[PDB]
Amino acid sequence: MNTVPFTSAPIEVTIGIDQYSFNVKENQPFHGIKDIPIGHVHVIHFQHADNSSMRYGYWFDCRMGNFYIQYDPKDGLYKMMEERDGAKFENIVHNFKERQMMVSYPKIDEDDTWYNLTEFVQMDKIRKIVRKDENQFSYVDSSMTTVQENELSDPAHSLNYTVINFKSREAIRPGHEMEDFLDKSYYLNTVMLQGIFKNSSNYFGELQFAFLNAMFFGNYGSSLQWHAMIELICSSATVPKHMLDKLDEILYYQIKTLPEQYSDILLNERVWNICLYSSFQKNSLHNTEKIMENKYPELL
Amino acid sequence: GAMNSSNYAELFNNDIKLFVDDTNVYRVTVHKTFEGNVATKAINGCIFTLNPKTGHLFLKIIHTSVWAGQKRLSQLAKWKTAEEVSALVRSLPKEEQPKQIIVTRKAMLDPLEVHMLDFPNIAIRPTELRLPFSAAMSIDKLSDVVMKATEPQMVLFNIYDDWLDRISSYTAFSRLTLLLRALKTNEESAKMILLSDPTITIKSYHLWPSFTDEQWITIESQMRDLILTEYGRKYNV
Numbered sequence: 001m002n003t004v005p006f007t008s009a010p011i012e013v014t015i016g017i018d019q020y021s022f023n024v025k026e027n028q029p030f031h032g033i034k035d036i037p038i039g040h041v042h043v044i045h046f047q048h049a050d051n052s053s054m055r056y057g058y059w060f061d062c063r064m065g066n067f068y069i070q071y072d073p074k075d076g077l078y079k080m081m082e083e084r085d086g087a088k089f090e091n092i093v094h095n096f097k098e099r100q101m102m103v104s105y106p107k108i109d110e111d112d113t114w115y116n117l118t119e120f121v122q123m124d125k126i127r128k129i130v131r132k133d134e135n136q137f138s139y140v141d142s143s144m145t146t147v148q149e150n151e152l153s154d155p156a157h158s159l160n161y162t163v164i165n166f167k168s169r170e171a172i173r174p175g176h177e178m179e180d181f182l183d184k185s186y187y188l189n190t191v192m193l194q195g196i197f198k199n200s201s202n203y204f205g206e207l208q209f210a211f212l213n214a215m216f217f218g219n220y221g222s223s224l225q226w227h228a229m230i231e232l233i234c235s236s237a238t239v240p241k242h243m244l245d246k247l248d249e250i251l252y253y254q255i256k257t258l259p260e261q262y263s264d265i266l267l268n269e270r271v272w273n274i275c276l277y278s279s280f281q282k283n284s285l286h287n288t289e290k291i292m293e294n295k296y297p298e299l300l
Numbered sequence: 301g302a303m304n305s306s307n308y309a310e311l312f313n314n315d316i317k318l319f320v321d322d323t324n325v326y327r328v329t330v331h332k333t334f335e336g337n338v339a340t341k342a343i344n345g346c347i348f349t350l351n352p353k354t355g356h357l358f359l360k361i362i363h364t365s366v367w368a369g370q371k372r373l374s375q376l377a378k379w380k381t382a383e384e385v386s387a388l389v390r391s392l393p394k395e396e397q398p399k400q401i402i403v404t405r406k407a408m409l410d411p412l413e414v415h416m417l418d419f420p421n422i423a424i425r426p427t428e429l430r431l432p433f434s435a436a437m438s439i440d441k442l443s444d445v446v447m448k449a450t451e452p453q454m455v456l457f458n459i460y461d462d463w464l465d466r467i468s469s470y471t472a473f474s475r476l477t478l479l480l481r482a483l484k485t486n487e488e489s490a491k492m493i494l495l496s497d498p499t500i501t502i503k504s505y506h507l508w509p510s511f512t513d514e515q516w517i518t519i520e521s522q523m524r525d526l527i528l529t530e531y532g533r534k535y536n537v
């Protein structure tokens with residue numbers, strides 16, 4: 001079980017740790033989060049009490065280093081940093097734990113929610129989407145635009161998701177225009193899976209990461225990416241059976257976790273109606289169709 | 301974006317453009333079978349591709365053999381249309397290629413866009429005008445070439461005959477759309493109006509009769525009356 005200590009909490013802030021959120025008051029004696037499960041990526045995220053604008057946060061994996069949070073009064077945000085002195089870090093963390101100045105990551109014996117939302121998400125792939133090679137962790141916020149959004153403006157602060165565009169020469173073989181537009185199997189299986197992602201695990205990892213950025217930061221380009229990656233599968237007549245079964249589980253847990261009040265902005269009516277009721281895969285997503293019809297029947 | 305009454309003179313500027321109408325591509329007769337079921341029989345069709353400034357009409361005849369063994373023919377027809385329009389553009393010298401293609405039905409936007417991905421600088425646009433190009437098969441010489449075709453064929457016409465020698469392309473288009481709207485609303489009467497007087501003939505190299513300027517005014521008035529009437533005979537007014 002790992003720990004992310006905080007130097008202090010000088011400004012009042014809502015701190016989220018994966019799907020959990022808690023409030024810290026201005027100058028409250030808070031020194032971080034302990035008992036963080038090893039084996040998963042995690043995200044620690046922030047919304048200031050005074051400015052609910054710009055939710056922001058950090059994706060990290062405690063196996064890759066010792067990380068802590070320290071507020072920067074010049075840049076006005078809680079910053080993740082890496083401590084290279086392992087003995088200093090261990091000593092700091094032990095003191096804070098002995099003084100009980102840390103919140104405990106929940107340990108519900110039954111709950112697989114975070115595993116199910118991050119099953120295919122790897123820190124090494126996050127760091128290729130979010131390019132800042134000098135750090136082992138990755139900053140994301142509400143305002144960051146995607147490479148595709150920037151084509152339609154600062155490249156270093158962009159989300160480098162894989163560009164998907166159904167009306168593009170990459171998606172459409174000369175001479176198979178109607179075939180490839182109406183059945184996207186060649187774009188899914190040859191171009192994207194064999195060509196770019198290499199396997200379906202990397203494809204699902206990017207889809208899961210895009211969803212989580214949409215949900216936790218309201219990042220609009222990430223929501224676009226998530227829906228595009230869903231639509232590409234649903235609009236393919238030929239999809240490996242294991243991928244369909246896994247997609248159904250992935251989306252079920254995403255829809256289950258989505259806050260009920262954010263469905264209006266985080267779910268695209270057209271994509272979901274097409275995917276569940278019109279697409280080649282309309283009958284292949286039983287768990288997702290059932291939870292959608294019981295939780296968000298209005299959208300449909 | 302879309303083409304409407306606000307940007308109507310754009311049709312007659314010096315940027316090459318084409319209208320594409322697909323309403324006569326897939327044509328059928330519906331009939332009963334010996335068992336008393338219903339079946340369709342395809343008949344030859346055509347793509348109506350028109351430069352509104354010059355009157356040049358690229359009439360690609362769609363022979364019924366293109367549908368043999370194919371499914372979902374109404375969907376295929378849009379894609380076949382887009383394939384043929386793309387082939388036409390590629391066949392034209394660069395300086396003759398259109399800068400814009402305006403489709404008369406919005407369902408042609410995606411098929412045409414996908415077929416024209418190689419031409420990112422050609423704009424594919426819808427229109428809010430309700431143009432009467434479906435009535436092109438009411439022009440006898442066009443119907444004749446379509447129905448006689450035994451294989452796929454492209455035939456070139458000038459749909460304005462020689463009118464541009466005396467009138468502008470705005471006026472020629474307005475005359476054409478008036479004639480076609482009349483033919484669409486009441487074909488028999490429109491054709492009576494056009495051919496009543498046997499001393500006015502259609503030249504071998506023309507589509508419409510050789511009306512003098514004064515006769516065109518009379519004809520045009522007769523067509524407006526027809527359209528207004530039928531509009532009464534229709535809504536009772």
Ligand SMILES: O=C(NC1CCCCC1)[C@@H]1CCCNC1
Nearest residue numbers: 017020021022103104105106108
């Ligand atoms: O939300 C919860 N705990 C918070 C975790 C972060 C620190 C503050 C408490 C749990 C989740 C379900 C079980 N009861 C409440």
